């Protein structure tokens, strides 16, 4: 099977698709799916994020009202880079 | 921590675990990078070829070290290949 690091990378990727398949396109997060992912799975790392509707807008870099995997990955990188600082 | 948060913490911590071994404690020398790949990415980087060449390719500022940003670009490469398998095209 996978190492601790490999399984962790796989979990990060799987979590996107778990949330993205709930409604509309199965390969992107709507605002509702993004809000679910944050509230369910990032309640600690995003505790101080403020308005989720604004954060969605900020991450939606091509202004199509959905987060594709690349845009979610940008969020993961932001969270990683904050953790690194500790 | 949630499953997702634990996983992001693991990805970050694994870097420092290998980086603190010798030299600058916040970067991977080529020896520390080879240890990380062999011990912790043996499957995802099974087909990577020369580790010394991979190190060079990841060492974007040619300082002979991988700082966290440079390791994170590797994790992104690996994540994109996983993404392909978690969203298969029937075509
Ligand atoms: Ca969706
Ligand atoms: Ca978008
Ligand atoms: Ca080092
Ligand atoms: Ca470097």
Swiss-Prot record, chain B:
The keyword RNA-binding does not apply. Residues 13-48 form the EF-hand domain. It comes from the Eukaryota. The modification Phosphoserine is found at residue 27. SMART domains: S_100. GO terms for biological process: mast cell degranulation; positive regulation of canonical NF-kappaB signal transduction; positive regulation of cytokine production; positive regulation of interleukin-1 alpha production; protein transport. Homodimer. Part of a copper-dependent multiprotein complex containing S100A13, FGF1 and SYT1. Interacts with FGF1 and SYT1. Interacts with IL1A. This is Protein S100-A13. It comes from Homo sapiens (Human). The lineage of its organism: Eukaryota, Metazoa, Chordata, Craniata, Vertebrata.
